[PDB]
Coordinates of C-alpha atoms in Angstrom, one line a residue:
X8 CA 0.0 0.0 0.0
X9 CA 3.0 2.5 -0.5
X10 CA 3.7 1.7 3.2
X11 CA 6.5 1.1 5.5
X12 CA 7.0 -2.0 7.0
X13 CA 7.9 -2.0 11.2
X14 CA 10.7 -3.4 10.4
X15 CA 11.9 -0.6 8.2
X16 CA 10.3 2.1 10.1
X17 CA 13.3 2.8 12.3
X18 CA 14.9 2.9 9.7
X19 CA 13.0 5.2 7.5
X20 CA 13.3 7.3 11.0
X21 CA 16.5 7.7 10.2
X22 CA 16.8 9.1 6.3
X23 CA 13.7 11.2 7.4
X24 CA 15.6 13.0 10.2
X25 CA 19.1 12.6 8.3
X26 CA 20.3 15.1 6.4
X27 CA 18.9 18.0 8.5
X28 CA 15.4 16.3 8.1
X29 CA 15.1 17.0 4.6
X30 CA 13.1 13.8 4.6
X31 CA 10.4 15.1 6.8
X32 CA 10.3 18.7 4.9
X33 CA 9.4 17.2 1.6
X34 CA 6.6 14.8 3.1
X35 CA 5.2 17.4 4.4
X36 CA 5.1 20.1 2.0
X37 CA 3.7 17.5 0.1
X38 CA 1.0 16.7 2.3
X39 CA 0.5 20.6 2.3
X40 CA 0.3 20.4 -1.4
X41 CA -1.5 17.4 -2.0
X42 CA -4.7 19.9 -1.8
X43 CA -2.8 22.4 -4.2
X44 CA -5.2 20.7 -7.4
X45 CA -7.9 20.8 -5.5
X46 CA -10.4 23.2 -4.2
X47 CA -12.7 21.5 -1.5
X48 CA -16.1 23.4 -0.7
X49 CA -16.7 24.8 3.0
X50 CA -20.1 27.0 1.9
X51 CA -21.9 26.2 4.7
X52 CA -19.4 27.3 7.3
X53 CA -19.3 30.7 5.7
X54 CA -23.0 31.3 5.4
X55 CA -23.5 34.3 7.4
X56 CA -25.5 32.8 9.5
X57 CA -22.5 29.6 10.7
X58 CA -20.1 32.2 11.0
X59 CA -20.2 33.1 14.6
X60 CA -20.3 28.9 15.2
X61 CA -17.1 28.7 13.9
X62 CA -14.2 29.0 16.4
X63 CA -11.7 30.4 13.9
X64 CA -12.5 31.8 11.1
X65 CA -10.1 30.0 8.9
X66 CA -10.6 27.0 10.1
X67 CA -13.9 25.6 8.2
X68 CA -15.5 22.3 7.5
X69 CA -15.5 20.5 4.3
X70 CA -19.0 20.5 3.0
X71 CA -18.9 16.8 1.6
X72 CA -17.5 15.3 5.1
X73 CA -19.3 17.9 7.5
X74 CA -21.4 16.5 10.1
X75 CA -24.6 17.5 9.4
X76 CA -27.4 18.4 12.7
X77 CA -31.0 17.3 11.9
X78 CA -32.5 20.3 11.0
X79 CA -35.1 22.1 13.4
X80 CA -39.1 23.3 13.8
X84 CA -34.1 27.4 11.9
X85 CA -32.7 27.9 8.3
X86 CA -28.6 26.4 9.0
X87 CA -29.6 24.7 12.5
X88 CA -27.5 21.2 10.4
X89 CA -24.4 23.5 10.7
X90 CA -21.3 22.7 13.4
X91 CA -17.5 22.8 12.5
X92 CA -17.2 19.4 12.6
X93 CA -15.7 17.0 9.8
X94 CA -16.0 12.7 9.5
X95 CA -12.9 11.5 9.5
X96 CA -11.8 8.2 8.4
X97 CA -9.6 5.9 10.7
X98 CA -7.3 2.4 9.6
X99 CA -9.4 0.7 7.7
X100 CA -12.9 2.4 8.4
X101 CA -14.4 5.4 7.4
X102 CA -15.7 8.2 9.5
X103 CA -14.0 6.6 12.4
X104 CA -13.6 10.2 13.9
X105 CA -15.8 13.3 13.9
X106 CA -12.7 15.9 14.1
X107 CA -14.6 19.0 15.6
X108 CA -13.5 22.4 16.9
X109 CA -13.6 23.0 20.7
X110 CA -17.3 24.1 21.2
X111 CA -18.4 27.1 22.0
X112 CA -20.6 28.5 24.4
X113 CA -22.9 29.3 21.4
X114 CA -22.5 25.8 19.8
X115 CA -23.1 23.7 22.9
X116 CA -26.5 22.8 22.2
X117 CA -24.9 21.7 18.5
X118 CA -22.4 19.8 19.8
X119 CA -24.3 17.5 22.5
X120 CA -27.0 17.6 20.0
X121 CA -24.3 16.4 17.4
X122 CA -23.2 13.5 19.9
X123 CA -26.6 12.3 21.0
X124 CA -27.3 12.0 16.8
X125 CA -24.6 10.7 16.3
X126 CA -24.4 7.8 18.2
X127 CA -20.8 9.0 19.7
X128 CA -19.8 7.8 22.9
X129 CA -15.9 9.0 23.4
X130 CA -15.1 12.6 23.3
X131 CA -11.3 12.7 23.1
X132 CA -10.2 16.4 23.9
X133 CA -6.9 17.6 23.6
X134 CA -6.6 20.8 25.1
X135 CA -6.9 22.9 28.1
X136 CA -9.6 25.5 28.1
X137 CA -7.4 28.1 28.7
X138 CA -3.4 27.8 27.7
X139 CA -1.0 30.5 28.5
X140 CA -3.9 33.0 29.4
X141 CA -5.7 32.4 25.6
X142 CA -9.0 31.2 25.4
X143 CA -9.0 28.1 23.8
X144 CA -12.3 26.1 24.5
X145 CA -15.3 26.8 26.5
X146 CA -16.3 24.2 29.5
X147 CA -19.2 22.3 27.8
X148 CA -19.5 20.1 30.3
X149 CA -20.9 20.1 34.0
X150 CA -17.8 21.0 36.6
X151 CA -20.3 18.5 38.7
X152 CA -23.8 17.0 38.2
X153 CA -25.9 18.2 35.6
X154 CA -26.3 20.8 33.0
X155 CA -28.7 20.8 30.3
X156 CA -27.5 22.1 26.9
X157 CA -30.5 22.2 24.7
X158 CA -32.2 19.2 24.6
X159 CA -29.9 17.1 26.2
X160 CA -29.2 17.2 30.0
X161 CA -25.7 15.6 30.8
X162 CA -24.8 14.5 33.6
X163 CA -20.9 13.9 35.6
X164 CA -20.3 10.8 37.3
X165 CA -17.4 10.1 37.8
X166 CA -13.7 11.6 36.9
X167 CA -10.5 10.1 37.2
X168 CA -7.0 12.2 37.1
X169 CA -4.2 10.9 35.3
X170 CA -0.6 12.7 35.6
X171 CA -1.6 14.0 31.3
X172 CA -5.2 13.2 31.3
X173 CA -8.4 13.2 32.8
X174 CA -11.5 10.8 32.1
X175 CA -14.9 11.9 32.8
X176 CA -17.8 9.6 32.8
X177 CA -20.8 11.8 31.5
X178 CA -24.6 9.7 31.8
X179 CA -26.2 12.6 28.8
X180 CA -30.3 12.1 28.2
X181 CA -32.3 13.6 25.3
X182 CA -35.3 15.0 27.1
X183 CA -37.1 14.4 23.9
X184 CA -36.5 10.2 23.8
X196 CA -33.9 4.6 25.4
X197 CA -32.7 8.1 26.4
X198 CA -29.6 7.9 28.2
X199 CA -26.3 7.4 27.5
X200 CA -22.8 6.7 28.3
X201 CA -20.1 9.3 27.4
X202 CA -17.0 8.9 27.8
X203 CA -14.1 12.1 27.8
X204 CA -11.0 11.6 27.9
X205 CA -8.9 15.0 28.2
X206 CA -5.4 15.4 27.7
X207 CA -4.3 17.6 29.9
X208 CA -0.2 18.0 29.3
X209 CA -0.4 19.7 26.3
X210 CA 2.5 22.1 26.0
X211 CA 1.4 26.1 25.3
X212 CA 4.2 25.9 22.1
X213 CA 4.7 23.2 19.6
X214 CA 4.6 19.4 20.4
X215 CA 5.0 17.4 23.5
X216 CA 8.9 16.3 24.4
X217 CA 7.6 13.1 25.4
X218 CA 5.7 11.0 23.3
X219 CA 5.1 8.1 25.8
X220 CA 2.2 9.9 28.1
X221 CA 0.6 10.7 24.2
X222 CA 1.2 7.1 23.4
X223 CA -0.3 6.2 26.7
X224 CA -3.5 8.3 25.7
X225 CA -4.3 7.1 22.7
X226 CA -4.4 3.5 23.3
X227 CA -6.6 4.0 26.0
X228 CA -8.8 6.3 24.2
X229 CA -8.8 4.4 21.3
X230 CA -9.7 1.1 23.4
X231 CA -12.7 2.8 24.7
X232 CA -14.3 2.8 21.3
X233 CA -17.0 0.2 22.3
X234 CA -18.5 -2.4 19.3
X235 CA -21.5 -0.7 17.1
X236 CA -21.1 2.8 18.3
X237 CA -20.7 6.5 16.3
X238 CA -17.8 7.6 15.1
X239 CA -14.9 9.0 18.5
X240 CA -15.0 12.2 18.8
X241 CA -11.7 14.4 18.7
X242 CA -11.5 18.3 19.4
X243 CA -8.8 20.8 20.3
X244 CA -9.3 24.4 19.7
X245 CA -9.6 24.2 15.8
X246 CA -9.8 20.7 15.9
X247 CA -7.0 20.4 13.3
X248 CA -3.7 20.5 14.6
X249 CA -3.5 18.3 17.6
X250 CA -6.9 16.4 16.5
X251 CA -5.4 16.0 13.1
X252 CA -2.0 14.1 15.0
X253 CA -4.4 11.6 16.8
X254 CA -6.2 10.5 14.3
X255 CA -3.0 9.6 12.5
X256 CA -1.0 8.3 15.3
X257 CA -4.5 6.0 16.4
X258 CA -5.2 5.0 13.0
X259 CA -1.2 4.1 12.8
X260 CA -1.2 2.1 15.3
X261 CA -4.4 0.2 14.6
X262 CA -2.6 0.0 11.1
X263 CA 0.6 -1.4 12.6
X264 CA -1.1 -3.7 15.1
X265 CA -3.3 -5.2 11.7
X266 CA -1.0 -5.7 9.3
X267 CA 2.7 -4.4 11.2
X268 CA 2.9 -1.4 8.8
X269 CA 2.8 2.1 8.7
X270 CA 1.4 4.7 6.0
X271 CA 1.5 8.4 7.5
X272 CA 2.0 10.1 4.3
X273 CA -0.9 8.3 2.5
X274 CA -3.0 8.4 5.4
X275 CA -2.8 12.1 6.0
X276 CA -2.6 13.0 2.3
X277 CA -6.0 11.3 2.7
X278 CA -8.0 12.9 5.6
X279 CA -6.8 16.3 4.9
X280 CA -9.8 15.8 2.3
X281 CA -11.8 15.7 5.1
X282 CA -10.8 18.6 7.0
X283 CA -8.7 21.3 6.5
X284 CA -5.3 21.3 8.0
X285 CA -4.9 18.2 9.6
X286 CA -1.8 18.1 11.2
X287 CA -1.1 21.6 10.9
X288 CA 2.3 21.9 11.3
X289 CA 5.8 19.9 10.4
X290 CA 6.7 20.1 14.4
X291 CA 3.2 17.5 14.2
X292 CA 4.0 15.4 11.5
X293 CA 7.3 14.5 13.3
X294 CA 6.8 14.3 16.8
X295 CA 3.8 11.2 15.2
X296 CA 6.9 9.3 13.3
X297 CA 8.5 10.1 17.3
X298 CA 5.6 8.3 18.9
X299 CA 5.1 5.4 16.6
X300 CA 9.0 5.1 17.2
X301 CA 8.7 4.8 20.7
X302 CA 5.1 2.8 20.3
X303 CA 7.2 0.1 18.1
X304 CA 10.1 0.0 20.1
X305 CA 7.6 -0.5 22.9
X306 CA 6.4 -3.3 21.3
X307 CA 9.5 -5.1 20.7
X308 CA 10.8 -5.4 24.2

């Protein structure tokens, strides 16, 4: 498939960094140009009306992958920032979402409850170095009701990078109650890409084992749900990828869901520190 075999990975490691990581520059300019021929459609996200429901303003959703709200009783009430994303070997594996808003929490639980989503993977803090990054769109304890869904704490467990929070959610409008699952990363630095890939390693597998049989697609967020979202879905799908057939395809993967949302692994410092972690993941594996 074009991929890497383990074996070969360290390997490839080392002509990507070598030669003052002139391996890594080109595959990732040309995973920044592999959209140069072709224009992908956001219309919805700039209708005037989806503007203000879009964290950044550059940062829009792909029409043909967006994840579409039922409409209302309400003219774009099927608008979020939120894209399907495929994973190893299954598609829309991942709704890759911005960090909600305060005037988009009613879409996003709304956007869970439809779509059958039971694992909210978040990967940022709120707040990071003093900037507003994501509103709190869940209950700091017991219940708050976003729209038509009421959810519900129970239970929260703090990790040294991570916290996982048991949410019970209920559509007053349904059975009608739910399981949901966040799991936060908490340890990501204010600048670039974590120094240690282990306690990101560590995350995703257990994020990723969450995903329970017949459910919706996991959701990911950050702030723009790009960056950071865009390096877990590759290093999940990776090692999914790796544990099915023991080989590795970042290039074609990414080259491949950056159809599906814009900016997906949004910088080089990303695209390496994921060939880091699968390192460390593999190396993991053989001792």
């Amino acid at each position: 498939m074009e991929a890497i075999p383990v074996k070969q990975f360290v390997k490839h490691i080392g002509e990507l960094y070598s030669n003052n990581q002139h391996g890594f520059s080109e595959d990732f300019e040309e995973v920044q140009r592999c959209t140069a021929d072709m224009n992908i459609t956001a219309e919805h996200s700039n209708h005037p009306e989806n503007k203000h429901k879009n964290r950044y303003i550059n940062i829009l959703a792909y029409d043909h992958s967006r994840v579409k709200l039922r409409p209302l009783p309400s003219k774009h009430s099927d608008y979020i920032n939120a894209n399907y994303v495929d994973g190893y070997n299954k598609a829309k594996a991942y709704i890759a979402t911005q960090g909600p808003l305060k005037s988009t929490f009613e879409d996003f639980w709304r956007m869970i409850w439809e779509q059958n989503t039971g694992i909210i993977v978040m990967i940022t803090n709120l707040v990071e170095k003093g900037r507003r990054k994501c509103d709190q769109y869940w209950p700091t304890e017991n219940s708050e009701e976003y729209g038509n869904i009421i959810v519900t704490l129970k239970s929260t467990k703090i990790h040294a990078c991570y916290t996982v929070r048991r949410f019970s959610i209920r559509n007053t409008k349904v059975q009608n109650e739910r399981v949901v699952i966040q799991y936060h990363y908490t340890q990501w630095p204010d600048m670039g890409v974590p120094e240690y890939a282990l306690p990101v390693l560590t995350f995703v597998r257990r994020s990723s084992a969450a995903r329970m049989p017949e459910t919706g697609p996991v959701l990911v967020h950050c702030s723009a749900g790009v960056g950071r979202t865009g390096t877990y879905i590759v290093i999940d799908s990776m090692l999914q990828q790796i544990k099915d057939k023991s080989t590795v395809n970042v290039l074609g993967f990414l080259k491949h869901i950056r159809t599906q949302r814009n900016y997906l692994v949004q910088t080089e410092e990303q695209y390496i520190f994921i060939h880091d972690a699968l390192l460390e993941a593999i190396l993991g594996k053989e001792t």
